[PDB]
From a paper:
Phosphoethanolamine (pEtN) cellulose is a naturally occurring modified cellulose produced by several Enterobacteriaceae. The minimal components of the E. coli cellulose synthase complex include the catalytically active BcsA enzyme, a hexameric semicircle of the periplasmic BcsB protein, and the outer membrane (OM)-integrated BcsC subunit containing periplasmic tetratricopeptide repeats (TPR). Additional subunits include BcsG, a membrane-anchored periplasmic pEtN transferase associated with BcsA, and BcsZ, a periplasmic cellulase of unknown biological function. Cellulose is a common bacterial biofilm component produced by a variety of prokaryotes, such as Escherichia coli (Ec), Salmonella enterica, and Gluconacetobacter/Komagataeibacter xylinus (Gx). These Gram-negative bacteria synthesize cellulose and secrete it across the cell envelope via the Bacterial cellulose synthase (Bcs) complex.
Although only the TM regions were resolved, the subunits were located ‘in front’ of BcsA near the periplasmic exit of its cellulose translocation channel. Taking advantage of recent improvements in 3-dimensional variability analyses and classifications implemented in the cryoSPARC data processing workflows, we reprocessed the previously published cryo-EM data (EMD-23267)20 focusing on the BcsA-BcsG complex, Fig. S2. Interprotomer contacts within the BcsG trimer are mediated by TM helix 4 of one subunit and TM helices 2 and 5 of a neighboring subunit, suggesting that BcsG is prone to self-polymerize. To test whether the NTD mediates interactions with BcsG, we performed AlphaFold2 complex predictions using either the full-length BcsA sequence or its NTD alone, together with three copies of BcsG’s TM region. The predictions reproducibly suggest the coordination of a BcsG trimer via BcsA’s NTD, Figs. 1f and S4b, which is predicted to fold into five short helices (α1-α5). The C-terminal helical region of Ec BcsA runs roughly in the opposite direction as the preceding amphipathic helix, which is present in BcsA from Rs and other species. This segment is resolved in our cryo-EM map and interacts with helix α5 of the NTD via an SxxPRxP motif (residues 850–856), Figs. 1e, f and S4a. No direct interactions are observed or predicted between BcsG and BcsA TM segments. The BcsG TM helices fit seamlessly into the opening of the BcsB semicircle, between the first and sixth subunit, Fig. 1e. Our cryo-EM analysis of the IM-associated Bcs complex reveals a single BcsA cellulose synthase associated with a trimer of the pEtN transferase BcsG.
Author numbering:
A (entry chain I): 68 to 444, 463 to 729
B (entry chain H): 68 to 444, 464 to 729
The structure:
Amino acid sequence: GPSRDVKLTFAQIAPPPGSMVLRGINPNGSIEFGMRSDEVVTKAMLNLEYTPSPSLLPVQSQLKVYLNDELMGVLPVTKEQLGKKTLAQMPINPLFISDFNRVRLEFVGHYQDVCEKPASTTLWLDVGRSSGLDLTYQTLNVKNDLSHFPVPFFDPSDNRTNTLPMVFAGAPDVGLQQASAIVASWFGSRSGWRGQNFPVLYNQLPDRNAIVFATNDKRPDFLRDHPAVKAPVIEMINHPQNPYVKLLVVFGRDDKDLLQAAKGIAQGNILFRGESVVVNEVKPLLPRKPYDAPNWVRTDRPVTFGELKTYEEQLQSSGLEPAAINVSLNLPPDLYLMRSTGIDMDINYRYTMPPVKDSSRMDISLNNQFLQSFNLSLDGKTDVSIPALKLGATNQLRFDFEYMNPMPGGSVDNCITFQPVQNHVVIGDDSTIDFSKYYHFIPMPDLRAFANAGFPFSRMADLSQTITVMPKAPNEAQMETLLNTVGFIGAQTGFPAINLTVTDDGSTIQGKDADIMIIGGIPDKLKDDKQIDLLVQATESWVKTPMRQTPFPGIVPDESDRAAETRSTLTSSGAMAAVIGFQSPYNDQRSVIALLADSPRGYEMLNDAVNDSGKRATMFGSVAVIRESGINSLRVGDVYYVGH
Amino acid sequence: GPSRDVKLTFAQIAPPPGSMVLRGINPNGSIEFGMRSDEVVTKAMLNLEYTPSPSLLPVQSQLKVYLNDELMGVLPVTKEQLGKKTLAQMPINPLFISDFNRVRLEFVGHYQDVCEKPASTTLWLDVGRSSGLDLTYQTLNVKNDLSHFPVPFFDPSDNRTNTLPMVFAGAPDVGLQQASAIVASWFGSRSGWRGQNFPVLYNQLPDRNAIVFATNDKRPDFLRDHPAVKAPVIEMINHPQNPYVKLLVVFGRDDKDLLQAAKGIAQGNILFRGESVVVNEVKPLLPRKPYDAPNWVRTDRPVTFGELKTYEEQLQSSGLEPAAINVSLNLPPDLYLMRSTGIDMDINYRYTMPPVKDSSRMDISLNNQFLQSFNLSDGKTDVSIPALKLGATNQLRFDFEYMNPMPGGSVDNCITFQPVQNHVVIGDDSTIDFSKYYHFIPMPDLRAFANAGFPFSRMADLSQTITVMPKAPNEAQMETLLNTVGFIGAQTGFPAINLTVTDDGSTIQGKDADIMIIGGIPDKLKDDKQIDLLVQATESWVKTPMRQTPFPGIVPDESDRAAETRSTLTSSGAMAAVIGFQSPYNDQRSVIALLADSPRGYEMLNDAVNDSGKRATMFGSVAVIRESGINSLRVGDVYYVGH
């Protein structure tokens, strides 16, 4: 079977800073990696480029490698490697590996053997960011059972961006488009932060796990002599060229049957069994609530920290120096602070009584911004008022415990020291955080929330109040960008779009209360609003520039730094994509976000910018222009507030 | 491609104390540099001529060399070189170099082993300012794509002056002059504090990247083969001799199309695509308000610290000794307060609560001068800044001075530990009022012009600004015009797009706008009243204002600033005269004249206007720039601008 040779380095598995330093207080460095439970590793090796300390002793210092609680090897320090950068090759036995492994490097060092100062900064060993673990994956044969779903298509263990191409049969219909969008949104919600890309190709066949859409009419070229189905059925067959890649052929009589199948897949994914699964009836019971997403916190009532734990071992730490506890809480980017009172949180922290009252403080930080420090000299219910002014869509709350332990040293001749004792730190699980007093009222025309959270469309979980307009007979690129943006919206939230509406005519939205989404060409029905700032055409394009451009604006905007100063029009022969956001001419409380290109290369740029989270989270303002030189954003046009 | 050896001394890249000392509380010494993004660094080595402390332990004390959090090598101190001067060269791996690199040196020291105490002045390692980085840049070939604009001409990762020569077609008319001035203003505004220089050549291709201006009738050299165009196009072609340098060719049917192309390049440059960009329609919607410049602070509303960061972690610090938090305020030089109460600001600082009140404080200072102090024993303090040094640019520095009352045990039992760090943060919500001021100042001086360009930069777009130029100017006068326009544009944050370049004095008669004389003073001017330093290329006369006292009062006096003697003399050298006076047509408008007597004088004037060290030392109403520097004096009548 096929076997790839991936060589992951130390710059994408190690902490953000990269090169880690192994001191005496934190001598453990862990890097995590896993396989998709289908491919088997072979010929795995670890290359370490470390530079020991010139002070530590040669033989009494060593670097231990632990794959999973098993010492794979021990590299000692020699007299020549005392202060020189040395390359060490460590073999990794491909037998103790599992679905998820954490290679842990532990460094022990001793510079003095008589009166060594524990936790001294003279001893250190830092691995280089050029290190890497080279391992080859070999693909095995899948059992071909729909019970394991979506394991063969999408495995949550893989950290690489999910690549799931969808193959239509050319010129999708109205129902087929919305069903494919539902499936893509479900896959994006299943993926999450991993990032998802759906390369769509018509009447072709890739060499990767794909999804084949069939409706008993306009079937792909290779779905020949297949019997018609009475009800929507989902069958998992193999590729005819090679049996080492599994497809997903969804069937149905008409577009409505395929939509029912997609709804059953997105919702009833827990009843999948065997190989073929027939859907017969799917009906809801009650609608969803606004601003209610599984990934977003509950703003209606205070939520405990127990509902904000990714793993059970998040709210506890140990060791000579207790590490900082980091918690993530996603919330909608509509929190507007009116009374400047902030949020009130009660932290029920339990700590260790220090030997002396030396103020082993504890600090709370929000996005690397110190909020307040509490003395430490044992649960305490403190009412912490957070002066929150930069609460966006995603943040990170850090509780650090700066422990300083005085150790009796004695005198010059009477050198006596004590080894450090480990301190246990735990945050109270009953601790709560309140977000009820925060209101929902913000400037609408900004798309920073759209790129970070998708707020304009993600008002409700199932996207009921959203209408996406598509051009007649879409090509590959238009459907590709549609699927990509729908999957991104679904991943930013926690629930897929089940009640989304797709239309091919631009006059069908006249008189409806919904958020309009333009994917291809802006229809002439609403193009006359003139609030659309940047328009991309075959070769011409005109943009409007504001009066003042500030890198960091204030909390409340002003009508003086957003008015269009000059309008510049020009034409060229290059590629350029545009992301614009304006007010709908049919309602004063809804918005329209349009992603538009002109050429296939522009669509490719738009897809590369939307799929990747590095280039997408760097846009703000009202308008964004994506070109070969990345993406440039500007805040032009009048501002209109949304909310109450 | 050509290789240029570069030696960056430690003086021009480190903070301006000259040298850096690495103590036990501040062992981090940082050095920032950048890469042009179109060149690759090869054979980079770091030299260090440092002195350690003699009380250091030889093996248990070393220094690191981190390049973007990557240890290139560690240097220990041997017993023989414990107190002596130590020179060491370390090879730097060019693979980890990026657009903006920060080399941080960390020093670890241990003078004792059983009872060593931090914050002690017995252990130290100081690097002299004789060291520097030795690296050889190697240019590459860009993709010739206009989407990366103005990347090949101006990179935000550079630190040296941006020399951008502009090749015209010879004897440019008013339209070409105005277009070149607009382009130079835009480039200077994009550059900013990096320094701007715009040499001009006629039918001479330069070595560096340049901009070519064409008209389809007076075609310059090496462009006769290019076919005629139907509309103003912007194309970036390669230099025929050496392709590693790029030239920006601007075409147009006539001067009006060239001006339109320049206006489009200035404003509509965010959507350049591929190559040969055709600009057709560039029209404005509404005019610009006075005192509306991006770099200058907004006076219509109270301004917060969020709009004055220009950074990400400027309002916060950490470590044992929290570094000072500096915020720069760029105010216009036209500010007058009769109430004399001073501007009030609402500081919302917060800090780490120390264990016991030990008189740890925070000092707020302005222009490197102590202003106020607050004890740390989390607030909305109203601080009234006395307006005594508020000029055109300043620096507001909050320095959190701490001292930790850490115990040390008894004489027979000394305790050991590691000192804890403390974080400080101001918060991007502290506002400062600036609407309680008026715009009324006596303006015969040149300090506001040299520092901010006030009389001409009242409107960021230079709408009411008339610059005269001689008939068929040479390279020197055009260079002077381009340089002064670029400087005015860089002091502000908006390109001068609506400036008016004229050639005859008939347009000056009956027009409400400031005057900028470059070539020479016209006949209607230089009436020998309120005008000094008339240089007829042979002799010159200067007036002494009866007194020359450094550091005058805030409000100037009229008894001292009065002409006493008119000394006339003929010489054989070269001089440049900067003269500021009042226009006879309008009382509010003013006339600034930058003139020279000889080509060497024009060169000295261009050099003075280009740099910034010799420009900040210019004040008064008259400035004479000779081969021995610039000397200024305040003479003439006083006229007030403002209501």
